Amino acid sequence: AFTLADRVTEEMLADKAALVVEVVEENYHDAPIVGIAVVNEHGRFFLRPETALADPQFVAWLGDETKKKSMFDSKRAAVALKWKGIELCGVSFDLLLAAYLLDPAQGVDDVAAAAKMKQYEAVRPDEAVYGKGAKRAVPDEPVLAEHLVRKAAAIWALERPFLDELRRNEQDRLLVELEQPLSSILAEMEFAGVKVDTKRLEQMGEELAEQLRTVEQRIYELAGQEFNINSPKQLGVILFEKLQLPVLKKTKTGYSTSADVLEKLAPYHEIVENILHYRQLGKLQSTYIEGLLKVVRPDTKKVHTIFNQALTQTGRLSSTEPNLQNIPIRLEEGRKIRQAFVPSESDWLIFAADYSQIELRVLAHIAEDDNLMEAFRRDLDIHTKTAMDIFQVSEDEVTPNMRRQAKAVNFGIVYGISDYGLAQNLNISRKEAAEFIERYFESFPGVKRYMENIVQEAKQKGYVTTLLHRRRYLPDITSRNFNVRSFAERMAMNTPIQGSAADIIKKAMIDLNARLKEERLQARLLLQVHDELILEAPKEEMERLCRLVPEVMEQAVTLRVPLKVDYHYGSTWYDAK
DNA sequence: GCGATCACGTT
DNA sequence: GACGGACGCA
Ligand SMILES: [Mg+2]
């Protein structure tokens, strides 16, 4: 029972409403709005967007921060409206973000999935209404309107139960003061986009094409035959049947040709180093050059990423189209791809600031490890210090390989890799990897106690938490399957570290955005990837940003150790180093 | 077009 | 020990 409205009425513009502004295209940048639903104290309404979005009263209502709206994935609507020149304000509850906080492992894709968390089933999944893949389509208006009204009615009914559970979890401020404000900031970042030097990218592609053509010819000569080097199956036949190289590792289907396996084969045949070079050149070309050019909008000459704020179980952001976090960080030629990301206006520059070792600093804080805290209080090189402690040697006795091994132990902590993974990364035995870890724990006994205590807490409570009260449930922590249990244990250890770093970065973004407005700077946030925040600003704002940005980031939270920020500016993202 | 795989960046 | 370009069927 709802009103299919042909005009906007005052009844539709109440102080509080559930609002659905439906964008069916997966990528919502400059995408159609196919329909609108409003549920409030006065009734339930379906509005056609060509009418409502042309109505000055409805547009004023949308932009009025005192008119409160409950939505699901408000950033999607906010950005689609930005492309139409319409501001969305007053979103006081986002059911997507609420469900994400309550349990990020549920994978809540749509209103129906969130509704099922509270035994509400009077709404269909989006996939059931719009179909999948090739058959995907907007249905006729009667079907569309009922769906959008059912989604709005679900939001209207679910706000209270969700807020009640968030309050019980001490997550209500996490939603209202962190994730929801961040959603608006992300919306602005996505809409602003990042300018891309497509001429430079095409230049890079041309250079890669030349080098690829030469290595490919080298491989055919060495193989005595032409084949598709990009086919693992064809390559396996050349390597393991034609050239009779050893089979050191299998796949489920045939022989593995992974880079790990190939490096082990390099001493036996000159073709192997060439295949490795082809693979590295080819992934830069196909994935990062051509992949980037594919998602540059020809109308803006910018990339307009979509952040997924409700995906990871740590609380880190993710992004797509492009995913700029997946650009390799190793200089070689991977990092140079950042040269293609330039300021959007003449006489502007890129300003980039990154937290230095925020994850290990968070660990020092949470574990209250005296040795690790003092190391950061002295602003030591943490990998050199870790090697000094593990090997019981003075700083001048730390060899490069000692530091490399200490760094791998620290990497293992930051990313939650097992002793098998440490052994894999260091190319040592599992017993030797285990012995390394015990030596580490002798030097950092507070870290060891934390690791023991957090696994026990996960077993007792069923979940672990971050500094700002994000939760991750770990039902597998007592699995009788060793691999499943071990993974759960590593996530118990790692999520309070990685997730607290994510919390701090998100708070820094909110604080930064507010400070930039308060200072009346034109500088704007563009991207957040890894532990870095990337802005662009007039060149005349750089000196001010050199003081302001690190200060805001260092002060986002107060820990038992300082937060350290590195910062640079330049004519491209790469040169902001 | 869709599903199953393989590889390689990130986490 | 998830998240995001390159063989058969049908
Ligand atoms: Mg780091």
Numbering used by the authors: 300 to 876
Sentences from the study reporting this entry:
In a surprising twist to this paradigm, a naturally occurring bacterial DNA polymerase I member isolated from Geobacillus stearothermophilus (Bst) exhibits an innate ability to reverse transcribe RNA and other synthetic congeners (XNAs) into DNA. Here, we describe two X-ray crystal structures of Bst DNA polymerase that capture the post-translocated product of DNA synthesis on templates composed entirely of FANA and TNA. The structures reveal a Y-shaped architecture common to A-family polymerases that encompasses the catalytic and exonuclease domains of the enzyme. The catalytic domain is further divided into the finger, palm, and thumb subdomains with the P/T duplex bound in a groove defined by the palm and thumb subdomains.
The only exception was the FANA template, which contained uridine residues in place of thymidine residues, as FANA thymidine amidites are not commercially available. The crystal structures were solved to resolutions of 1.6 and 1.9 Å for the FANA and TNA bound structures, respectively. However, the post-translocated product observed in the FANA structure reveals formation of the n + 2 nucleotide addition product indicating that the polymerase underwent two rounds of catalysis. The first nucleotide addition generated the correct fA6-dT10 Watson–Crick base pair, while the subsequent addition produced an fU5-dT11 mispair at the n + 2 position. Relative to a previously solved Bst DNA polymerase structure for the natural n + 2 translocated product, the misincorporated dT11 nucleotide occupies the same position but exhibits greater rise, tilt, and twist than the correct dT5–dA11 Watson–Crick pair observed in the natural system. The second nucleotide adduct, which is presumably due to prolonged incubation of the enzyme with the TTP substrate, provides structural evidence for a fU–dT mispair, which could be relevant to future studies that examine the fidelity of DNA synthesis on XNA templates. By contrast, FANA maintains the same C1′-exo conformation observed in the solution structure of a FANA duplex. The shorter P···P distance of the TNA strand is due to the backbone repeat unit of TNA, which has 5 atoms (or bonds) rather than the normal 6-atom backbone repeat unit found in DNA and RNA. Both strands of the DNA/FANA duplex have P···P distances of ∼6.6 Å, which closely approximates the all-natural DNA system. By comparison, the DNA/FANA duplex is nearly identical to a standard DNA/DNA with a normal six-atom backbone repeat unit. Several unique interactions are observed between active site residues, mostly from the palm subdomain, and the chimeric duplexes that are not observed in the natural system, including eight new interactions to the DNA/FANA duplex and 13 new interactions to the DNA/TNA duplex.
